Amino acid sequence: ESLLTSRQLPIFCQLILRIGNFLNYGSHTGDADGFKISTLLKLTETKS
Amino acid sequence: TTALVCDNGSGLVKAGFAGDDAPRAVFPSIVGRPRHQGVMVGMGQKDSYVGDEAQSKRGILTLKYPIEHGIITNWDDMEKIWHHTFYNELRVAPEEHPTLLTEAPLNPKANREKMTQIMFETFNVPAMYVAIQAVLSLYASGRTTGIVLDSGDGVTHNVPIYEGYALPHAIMRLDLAGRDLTDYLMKILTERGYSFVTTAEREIVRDIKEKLCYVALDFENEMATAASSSSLEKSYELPDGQVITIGNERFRCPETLFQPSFIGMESAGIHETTYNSIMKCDIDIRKDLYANNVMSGGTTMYPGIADRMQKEITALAPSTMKIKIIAPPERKYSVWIGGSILASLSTFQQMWITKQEYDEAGPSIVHRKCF
Amino acid sequence: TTALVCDNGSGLVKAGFAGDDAPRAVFPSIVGRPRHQGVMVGMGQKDSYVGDEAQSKRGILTLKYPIEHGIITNWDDMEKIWHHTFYNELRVAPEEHPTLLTEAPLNPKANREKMTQIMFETFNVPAMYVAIQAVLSLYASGRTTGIVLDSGDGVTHNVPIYEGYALPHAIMRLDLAGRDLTDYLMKILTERGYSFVTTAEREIVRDIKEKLCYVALDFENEMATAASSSSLEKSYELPDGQVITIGNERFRCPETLFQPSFIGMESAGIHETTYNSIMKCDIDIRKDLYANNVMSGGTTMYPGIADRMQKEITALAPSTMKIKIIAPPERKYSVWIGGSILASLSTFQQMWITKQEYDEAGPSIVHRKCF
Amino acid sequence: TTALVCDNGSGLVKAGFAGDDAPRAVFPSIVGRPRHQGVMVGMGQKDSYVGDEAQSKRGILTLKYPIEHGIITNWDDMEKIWHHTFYNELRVAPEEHPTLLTEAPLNPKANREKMTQIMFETFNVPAMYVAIQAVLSLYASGRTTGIVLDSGDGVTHNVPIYEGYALPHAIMRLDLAGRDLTDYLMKILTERGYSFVTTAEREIVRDIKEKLCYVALDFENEMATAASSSSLEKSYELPDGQVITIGNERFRCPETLFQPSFIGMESAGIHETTYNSIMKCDIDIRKDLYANNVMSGGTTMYPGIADRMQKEITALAPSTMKIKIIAPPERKYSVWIGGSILASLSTFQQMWITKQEYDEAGPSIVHRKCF
Amino acid sequence: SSIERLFSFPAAEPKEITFLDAKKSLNLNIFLKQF
Ligand SMILES: Nc1ncnc2c1ncn2[C@@H]1O[C@H](COP(=O)(O)OP(=O)(O)O)[C@@H](O)[C@H]1O
Ligand SMILES: Nc1ncnc2c1ncn2[C@@H]1O[C@H](COP(=O)(O)OP(=O)(O)O)[C@@H](O)[C@H]1O
Ligand SMILES: Nc1ncnc2c1ncn2[C@@H]1O[C@H](COP(=O)(O)OP(=O)(O)O)[C@@H](O)[C@H]1O
Ligand SMILES: [Mg+2]
Ligand SMILES: [Mg+2]
Ligand SMILES: [Mg+2]
């Protein structure tokens, strides 16, 4: 029910979708309307 | 342009330049962290010792293996291993040299995703390649076909390849190799009263295993000989100056390779794994695999393993056809030698993985490109 | 803003600046009070003489040592010791100078709290650091690894350090040094008829111990030679002009360091403490610690002690490995010299205990900022 | 006849007759040799005090423990211990009474050989048996299966047992028990200034540990509470009448069981040893083992250890599954009590080692007849 | 702008006229290279 009523997680995945769609521009994974659950564990892979 | 061959094995990373015979940089894959307190201010007390420095100063270092059971578990440690093997050992820029790498069979795909992303985002290369270790070992044996039992530090896997076609269903994997033999050797040395509990002591017991252990040709006769006469006892000098003497532990430790019930595993020995790999092949091509039993990995360095292996397969297989064991003396580095063979080929220019392929197809073109 | 190093040892306070070679002010730590009746009015009668003034006029003074076995007992006397070494010996304001104090390991923590409270509230500083003396001895030796046996006047302690890392479980402390040797030298000097009971006579027996005693290479043969022939006997002139002659007491006095059962203590000698400290260390680093035995402290000024330490450890160690006793000629002040090296280190500026940090953390940061 | 149970433990020997619930002769395993000079004539005073006699007169005795980490060091002292418990405490002839012995897992086998040789030659018995202590601890609980964490005075070992069969490969050993906690408590009482250096003082520190120490449920909160207010401070009266007060050392001392890095051991705590012992077993037999933690040993008397054990295991375990810590109140004597249970059965009579079996098979049937 | 500042890349006879396919030529080259 907490996952059903989580409001901040749509806002978070919208921000991650905007950042990823900026990041993978010019690749086949760009212009994505969504992603899987396992994107969150792969967030720390792209390092500065 | 000279390529680089770098087998990132579970035990020791073996790297060097392509087109050569021997790897220039052989060093164990450990990350050593100090567990005590520093009091001496200055002189470059670096917080994480990698490789040979971690081996030399190991008496104050908790040692961690980034590759456990052929799987890269810790990733930052593996990045430190790659940084040391490129910048400190070879001292070459990655952006001007191709880098061949190796991998275990039946690996997870996301492992290949992560290795591709590290080899194209952090350590940028012009090109790179991931190959199966058994395939490169068969290439360094000079034969296109054959069955390879590769036994490293964590994985003993059987792979039969017929005419370059590596059969996927017949590949199997047994999680019993050199580190398990070292842990069992720690366990059985306590019967003689020698205690080895720390990770620093694992290198000493591993050196004992490398220097003194050997595969028995018959186990029960070696029990009878060891219990009867103390002729096979051998002495070893520890780094603190103490001298131990070991008896049957020279051949009870590799016998776990043939009897996994010592450490409590229900699966049988590597011979039954080889034989059950052989029945998974077609009946036409089984004859070629019997005469082409190739070994690789340093767990096959014990100087009684070939005749015992031929005895075990000849007991298992029907005796109507020929059994032959391919055991070259340089089969420790045959993964690296096969990589050096494969890197300097004129055809191999068109199977390179470019940065343009990486940018077009993510870190995922390695699945559709390689086997 | 230069730095002060003030080794507040049990016997001899050694203080000086940072970067200097030899310690500027070396004077014994005694507070002397008059015990007879002053009859001659005027003359500026001090209620307490501190230092060399108490040493010179010692025939009419009860002398008290404020530090006993590295633990400061009388805090007013130690306040007067600090007042003398700042305002009369070095003639420096401590409000414009940092201070490095030395401390024996395994000390009471309330002692460290009280030197923190006095040194930041009575003689308030910009900064102060309390450091272990053995690390300073290894600083002055210049080598990074090594085991350090430091034997002052009250504390004989072993601290082993490998490649910049101390091992706190292998640190051991023994309350047996030169004050107990002075008391035992009195107790064996009563055999020849010479009586010494007062606090002034401790200085005379201490001077006898400094000037005439020596460590025997073999105790039993030296006993047989001194019992047989009167060649080892030596004469010393007292301050009243009388001449004493001592024989075996030249080498029965320091042998308490190798045989502590003379004064009834149960523990074994300093060589056994060194060997047990090395066996308490990890097995890889004992090769470095055998080759780098660093002695320090004024108790090791006896001119036979290095050969005896080498002989005892080479008896105890395995014979496949070299023992080397590092004994510099200036090892009395090596605690001070390594303190002056440490205070001149540019890296050491970041771990000063500031007055700001003392105010924000109470007298409790000295457990966490120091070792 | 009536059998004997003699748990020859590392710190205390618990002997008594079979069929009984209370051990008749519980006495510490020490040998007290005099060190000072006797001046009485009249003889009477022995050269070696054994047991409670050494405890009573401990102020003039060097105390030697014959057993160190479950290994009998001095066999003459342990022979004196056996002679005292056979002839003075229990007062039985050894050659007319069966006698059950206990032994720790993963011992050197020559220790078992020498115990067999002494019990069949010096104190020759009609029969004997050597058995694993954790098995007898489980037999005291009235259950057939479960895991026993036996934490004695030298060895803390985890043994899982399924259907009366102790699984050999999953048994683990940790050389950290009550003597090391006593040494660490002796180390940390110097912070408050209470010095303890003699072997007699180790019994006083052990009595402090027995009467006042306890396992914290949450270690960091107990740090915060003891550092905040003096509520957990408790006072103890010494044999000379001095009163000490200890605070956090009541629960810094048993926390070495859950954090072995306090005394420099690299290995993990007893909860991790329990968990990794259970993951070394098969999955299907795990259902008995989490629900049947049967703690034993004298170190497990601290009155917060069951809840801390349940908390740490339930943190470690998968959450779908019951954790039950069966901590009986008499689990100190559960080795002896279970020995009386096993020795008072008609089914055990065929399992004895007769003298005839010793004569045909040497002192080596104990590796074969006894598991 | 910050993402392009931080996470951007810091990098700003061919024909052999073989009638055979790549597989048999590769097997032949690996077979030839052992000599
Ligand atoms: N001379 C030797 N004798 C016995 N065993 C060896 C010898 N040399 C190496 N080994 C063992 O084999 C392993 C060799 O590593 P290798 O197979 O080259 O890569 P990895 O095992 O890391 O995949 C080491 O872990 C070592 O324990
Ligand atoms: N030449 C000497 N020979 C023998 N012993 C000496 C000599 N000089 C000093 N000592 C002893 O060493 C002690 C000095 O050591 P030190 O570390 O300076 O003590 P502290 O610093 O505690 O005053 C003195 O107490 C003295 O007993
Ligand atoms: N009431 C107690 N509280 C805390 N510790 C105890 C208590 N009783 C015994 N011990 C500890 O247990 C040790 C004895 O354990 P024991 O069960 O005899 O082990 P073992 O049989 O292996 O010697 C003693 O040394 C003591 O330190
Ligand atoms: Mg390998
Ligand atoms: Mg001194
Ligand atoms: Mg016990």
Short mmCIF file of C-alpha atoms in Angstrom, two decimals, chain D residues 75-221:
data_model
loop_
_atom_site.label_atom_id
_atom_site.label_comp_id
_atom_site.label_asym_id
_atom_site.label_seq_id
_atom_site.Cartn_x
_atom_site.Cartn_y
_atom_site.Cartn_z
CA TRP D 75 51.52 -33.24 30.22
CA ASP D 76 53.07 -33.61 33.69
CA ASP D 77 50.77 -30.89 35.07
CA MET D 78 47.74 -32.52 33.46
CA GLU D 79 48.84 -35.88 34.89
CA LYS D 80 48.93 -34.16 38.29
CA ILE D 81 45.43 -32.80 37.60
CA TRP D 82 44.20 -36.30 36.72
CA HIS D 83 45.91 -37.76 39.80
CA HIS D 84 44.31 -35.12 42.02
CA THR D 85 40.82 -35.64 40.59
CA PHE D 86 41.10 -39.44 40.77
CA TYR D 87 42.75 -39.81 44.17
CA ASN D 88 41.89 -36.69 46.19
CA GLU D 89 38.66 -35.08 44.97
CA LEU D 90 36.59 -38.03 43.83
CA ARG D 91 38.74 -40.69 45.62
CA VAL D 92 38.20 -43.62 43.25
CA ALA D 93 40.52 -46.29 41.97
CA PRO D 94 40.82 -45.77 38.18
CA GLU D 95 41.10 -49.49 37.35
CA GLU D 96 37.61 -50.36 38.60
CA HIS D 97 35.49 -47.55 37.16
CA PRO D 98 34.48 -46.57 33.61
CA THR D 99 35.38 -42.98 32.84
CA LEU D 100 34.00 -40.74 30.10
CA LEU D 101 36.25 -38.02 28.69
CA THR D 102 35.44 -34.95 26.62
CA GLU D 103 37.43 -33.32 23.82
CA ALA D 104 37.07 -30.19 21.69
CA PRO D 105 36.61 -30.46 17.91
CA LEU D 106 39.40 -29.97 15.34
CA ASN D 107 42.10 -30.83 17.87
CA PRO D 108 45.55 -32.10 16.95
CA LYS D 109 45.28 -35.88 16.87
CA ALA D 110 48.49 -36.50 18.85
CA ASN D 111 46.86 -34.81 21.85
CA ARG D 112 44.16 -37.49 21.64
CA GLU D 113 46.89 -40.14 21.22
CA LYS D 114 48.68 -38.99 24.37
CA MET D 115 45.44 -38.78 26.38
CA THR D 116 44.62 -42.33 25.26
CA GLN D 117 48.12 -43.49 26.24
CA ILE D 118 47.92 -41.90 29.71
CA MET D 119 44.39 -43.19 30.36
CA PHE D 120 45.40 -46.69 29.30
CA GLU D 121 48.88 -46.86 30.88
CA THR D 122 49.26 -44.48 33.85
CA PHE D 123 45.68 -44.32 35.11
CA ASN D 124 44.67 -47.52 33.35
CA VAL D 125 40.90 -47.89 33.26
CA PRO D 126 38.58 -50.85 32.54
CA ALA D 127 37.05 -48.76 29.73
CA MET D 128 36.87 -45.18 28.52
CA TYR D 129 35.47 -43.11 25.67
CA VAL D 130 36.43 -39.76 24.15
CA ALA D 131 33.55 -37.70 22.83
CA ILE D 132 32.80 -34.26 21.44
CA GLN D 133 31.67 -31.75 24.08
CA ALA D 134 28.98 -30.06 21.96
CA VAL D 135 27.31 -33.45 21.38
CA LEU D 136 27.05 -33.99 25.13
CA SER D 137 25.76 -30.44 25.57
CA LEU D 138 22.99 -31.25 23.09
CA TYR D 139 22.32 -34.51 24.96
CA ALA D 140 21.84 -32.48 28.15
CA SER D 141 19.03 -30.55 26.44
CA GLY D 142 17.01 -33.73 25.82
CA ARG D 143 16.97 -33.18 22.06
CA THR D 144 18.56 -35.12 19.23
CA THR D 145 19.30 -32.30 16.78
CA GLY D 146 20.39 -28.70 17.03
CA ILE D 147 23.46 -26.51 16.98
CA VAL D 148 25.70 -26.03 19.99
CA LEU D 149 27.89 -22.98 20.47
CA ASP D 150 30.25 -24.23 23.15
CA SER D 151 32.39 -21.38 24.50
CA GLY D 152 34.72 -22.80 27.09
CA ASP D 153 37.92 -21.36 28.52
CA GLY D 154 40.18 -21.80 25.50
CA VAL D 155 38.04 -22.70 22.47
CA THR D 156 34.74 -21.29 21.23
CA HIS D 157 33.44 -23.79 18.69
CA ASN D 158 30.22 -24.14 16.71
CA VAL D 159 28.92 -27.66 15.99
CA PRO D 160 25.66 -28.37 14.14
CA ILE D 161 24.20 -31.82 14.80
CA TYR D 162 21.49 -33.46 12.69
CA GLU D 163 19.73 -36.56 14.12
CA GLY D 164 22.56 -37.31 16.54
CA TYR D 165 25.16 -37.03 13.76
CA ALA D 166 27.56 -34.10 14.07
CA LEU D 167 28.33 -32.75 10.60
CA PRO D 168 32.15 -32.65 10.42
CA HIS D 169 32.87 -30.16 7.65
CA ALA D 170 30.56 -27.46 9.02
CA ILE D 171 32.12 -27.43 12.52
CA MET D 172 34.18 -24.29 13.12
CA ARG D 173 36.63 -23.25 15.78
CA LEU D 174 37.63 -19.88 17.22
CA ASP D 175 40.53 -19.43 19.65
CA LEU D 176 38.79 -16.80 21.76
CA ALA D 177 37.24 -17.68 25.10
CA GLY D 178 37.27 -16.83 28.79
CA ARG D 179 41.04 -16.63 29.29
CA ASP D 180 41.34 -14.09 26.48
CA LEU D 181 38.45 -12.10 27.95
CA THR D 182 40.29 -12.21 31.29
CA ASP D 183 43.49 -10.97 29.63
CA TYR D 184 41.58 -8.19 27.85
CA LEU D 185 39.89 -7.21 31.12
CA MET D 186 43.33 -7.18 32.77
CA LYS D 187 44.47 -4.93 29.92
CA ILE D 188 41.56 -2.50 30.23
CA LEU D 189 41.60 -2.21 34.04
CA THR D 190 44.88 -0.28 33.66
CA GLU D 191 42.83 2.61 32.22
CA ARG D 192 41.39 3.26 35.69
CA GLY D 193 44.81 2.57 37.20
CA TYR D 194 44.15 -0.88 38.67
CA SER D 195 47.28 -2.84 37.82
CA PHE D 196 47.24 -6.64 37.67
CA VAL D 197 50.38 -8.46 36.54
CA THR D 198 50.64 -11.66 38.54
CA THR D 199 49.00 -15.01 37.88
CA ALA D 200 47.24 -14.69 41.25
CA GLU D 201 45.64 -11.43 40.08
CA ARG D 202 44.23 -13.24 37.02
CA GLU D 203 41.93 -15.15 39.36
CA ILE D 204 40.75 -11.86 40.89
CA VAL D 205 40.08 -10.37 37.44
CA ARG D 206 38.30 -13.64 36.54
CA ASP D 207 36.13 -13.28 39.66
CA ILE D 208 35.35 -9.68 38.64
CA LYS D 209 34.41 -11.00 35.19
CA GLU D 210 32.25 -13.72 36.72
CA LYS D 211 30.40 -11.52 39.17
CA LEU D 212 29.97 -8.17 37.41
CA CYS D 213 30.35 -8.50 33.63
CA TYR D 214 27.36 -8.84 31.30
CA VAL D 215 26.60 -8.82 27.58
CA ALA D 216 25.17 -5.57 26.26
CA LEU D 217 22.06 -5.87 24.12
CA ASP D 218 23.10 -2.85 22.03
CA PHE D 219 26.76 -1.97 22.43
CA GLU D 220 26.66 1.63 21.19
CA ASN D 221 23.72 2.61 23.39
#
